[PDB]
Design a protein around this ligand. Structure first.
Ligand code: LYS
Ligand code: LYS
Ligand code: LYS
Ligand code: LYS
Lengths: 296, 296, 296, 296
């Protein structure tokens, strides 16, 4: 259901700090037309941390309606509060999302029993498929392979992982412990190539916001087994992947999209800031031009 | 204003998962009569992550009202969303809190510019004194000493730090960069002793929830320069400091409080769980026995 | 020159703690006959830390003589003392090694200028090709991509890397910064598959000591672009890769070889110990049997 | 026996890269007359990694002879090769050293069983007191408190620790597990103050090479319980503690000594380099000026 290049969509804001709904709808249409295979609204890259409950729901709602069944929608339902996750998960189901992305809780650092209680409570509260989002670089704690396998064995609708660890040996361990039917998606653009050869089938991607067509061509080469061609795309994309997280990727992606002529403002919500260093903007501009993305 | 032993208060819940207001008031009264010198409600140990906005405000309001000016109240106003932090901070000011505890944003990983914008926006929106809560073991990012000093120089109401790093050399760096008028409080029970000899003046403490009198006597001896007696207290308290974070401190503290016979239920909110391993519970019982506070 | 499966050879010892030269010669012959493509004597897995200078030289000498030109020999010349590295490097050249493996210095933590002085002094002292061995999990410091590229640009005989980081995004960065002619070899068995699709051409391998034939078949599938078959081998090998470093791989490899009927004693040199926990031996035995390696 | 300020002595070299014996003797004499209470020759700050076996022994012999029983001598006998450690330890005993400093093995990463075998074998081969040097920032592995306590319980000549972790809570754990007769010495200049109030009795110090008198006055004030005066010294010394490890401490200390006008050349041994960045040198000059020891 979810495979190849799946953008973790930005949430564009107006000059007055409201949701820029027109810009968001335009962004989704453009992503679909350039070859993105699925959509993740209201995730980390969507600045879900700085959305209200109502805005978060509206972002998921708009994405589902705009996709109109052409591509599947995996709604962000991540929280460090299980009660809030269930409410976001039930909202997404009732509005027509195809699946849920649920991050390992951040800041309060549950132990293994807490991870089982968190993901099990969410799984019992909806019937949608659930992807575990494992990202210790943001959550500190890491779900281990034993816990992940127990959850897959216990709950039929825990079906996959967004693995942002960048340690691709874990993809082998997850494939063996959880089964080859467990759906593994890379959560790290720069290692998504090797992640797929270890058993992944796609990437929930930051860079796809900015370069959706090449990102899709890259994942298509992989799924066709043309790994020589996939490595050519990797060499082209790698500098952009890297330049987009010199500073926080939220503001770097919006900077790049604005520069490319997309109708996306630079506005982000504190504690993100839209001011980038000149050296950062230079690195992004050079990586964009290497790929050849400026229409002008 | 804030010195010696300051509990990071637990938030007790009823069996039906409401705030147990009677238990909370009783805990505060007991804390004050056993010698705690201040109170931090609705912090990390207070399970702020799983309180609603309404419940968070209620916990702060009820602490301020109960304390009634007897000891100063430093309200938790931490969030990874600057707008939410401003709203919690202004509610705490309006309800009568004496100061604010503001954690470095978690999960979304702002850069230094983002930290300046976050703490600056809060400082601009209230007149209360603000304490920076630096805890990279939960937030991943760490505020560095240049950033902390710049905030202190820029905003007269950024007055201190809760330093949970446990790396005591930072207390010297912060003392030199921010000045000796900068109020440093340990955020790490096990190294609070060394933190004060490097320039700290107290501890925002997990263990004080369970053993307020002995923690207060410990901080009193340091304040009086009786560091020989303080080491004796360190040796009695250290096993309990350590036993309370074998598993998450929230559940460990509430278990210890029930073991002491206080009117605190074991209920915590998911993703936290109240069930502790048998070996954890026995480690806590033995450390409590060692301070006589049970068996003897 | 170096490609596919290259064992980091153990150094077997007698009951009386001398070099077991017969066992070592037998091990090399067997490796060559099972398909290993190159040899690394007197590296980390060869217990180079506990060899005298004279033993180290003798191990390199024996390996070169035994290989007799059938496969190339990359002699370990690693030290945290540049003077010692030059002496080991010149010995290896003069005895007929085909190349050198030079680890980033351990324990004394040189800075970038020290890495340039170390690798440049060695490169100027021999004419053999040199592979940089980057392994921060043992050395703490990590050579960065800029330093590695500068060394490749400055010294024509610095030609490759054994990359033990297990972070395969670095293979993309090294390929771009150093060129596609820079020879990248995985130093991490469990991620060698994805390392090759990012641009690696082989693996200097711990596990190849124990399962040389499957390890060679695995690397041959990769070099033929049969990545579906390579993933089948990965699933078979991954449990063995992992079980061999539950405890130090030196003693785990020797345990496994002894169990398989090879003429290799369990003897290792302190601070390694040959005693393994029963759970470790069980995990190794199950992984060996899954692969089907016991002749009996 | 070992207390207060104990320099981890540099090893000066002549312009022709021999041991500068006259400079070494002069450094020791000066150290003793400025109030250092003990001496550690041929340690990490002594560049033990780049000394030959013969030179290492010579450095220990010359220190013992120069000291002449005036202050006790704790000889570096660290190696990652147990056999080498035994040989250095027995040479130090035979030449007249008073104790031994033995680092946790680096690079080859023994497990706990290996640590017991390493330190047990050394303890069995000498009658001198042995101090465990725990420094995971250089060795990666850390000896845990149960292992340290088991070694202390098992071997009567394992008497103390040089604890370079800088995590002061470990001093309390070691004090409780190993007993208050266990001799704890800070291995981290910047946190030595807090380490002693937690139970330490001195510091094996890098900074003492450069400022022996003030370091001795600092440790004297702690010994006398004048922790107010000790904090004043902390504030004067901390910028120099920090300036001496911007770049590797070896070269930084020798640069500071030349800046003071001592007869110490800048020569260090590769992979260390003597060239320091201009900003590093100025940070060192300013910190020296701040303790008046130059300009005033
Ligand atoms: N800032 C809070 C609330 C976000 C709620 C909507 N996603 C958090 O990151 O958990
Ligand atoms: N769970 C969210 C919202 C909590 C808001 C009330 N304290 C967070 O931890 O940021
Ligand atoms: N044990 C020392 C010497 C080994 C010399 C022969 N390889 C080291 O690891 O550097
Ligand atoms: N360089 C080797 C040998 C030094 C032997 C004399 N100290 C090591 O650091 O282990």
């Amino acid at each position: 259901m979810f495979q190849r290049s799946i953008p973790a969509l930005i949430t564009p804001f107006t000059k007055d700090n409201l949701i820029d709904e027109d810009s968001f709808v335009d962004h989704i249409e453009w992503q679909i037309s350039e070859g993105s295979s699925g959509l993740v609204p209201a995730g980390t890259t969507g600045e879900s941390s700085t959305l209200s409950y109502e805005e978060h729901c509206r972002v998921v709602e708009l994405c589902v309606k705009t996709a109109a069944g052409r591509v599947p929608v995996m709604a962000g339902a991540g929280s460090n509060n299980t009660k809030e996750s269930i409410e976001l998960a039930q909202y997404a189901q009732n509005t027509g999302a195809d699946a849920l992305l649920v991050v390992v809780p951040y800041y309060n650092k549950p132990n293994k029993k807490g991870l089982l209680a968190h993901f099990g409570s969410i799984a019992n509260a909806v019937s949608l498929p659930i992807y575990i989002y494992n990202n210790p670089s943001r959550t500190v704690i890491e779900m281990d392979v034993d816990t992940m396998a127990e959850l897959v064995k216990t709950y039929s609708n825990i079906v996959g992982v967004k693995d942002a660890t960048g340690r691709i040996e874990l993809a082998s361990g997850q494939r063996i412990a959880c089964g080859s039917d467990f759906i593994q998606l890379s959560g790290d653009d720069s290692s998504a190539l090797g992640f797929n050869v270890h058993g992944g089938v796609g990437c929930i991607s930051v860079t796809a916001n900015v370069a959706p067509r090449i990102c899709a061509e890259f994942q298509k080469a992989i799924s066709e087994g043309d790994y020589r061609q996939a490595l050519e795309y990797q060499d082209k994309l790698f500098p952009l992947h890297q330049a987009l997280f010199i500073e926080p990727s939220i503001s770097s992606v919006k900077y790049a999209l604005s520069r490319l002529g997309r109708n996306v403002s630079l506005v982000v919500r504190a504690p993100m800031v839209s001011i980038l260093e000149k050296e950062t903007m230079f690195a992004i501009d050079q990586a964009l031009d290497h790929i050849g993305l400026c229409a002008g």
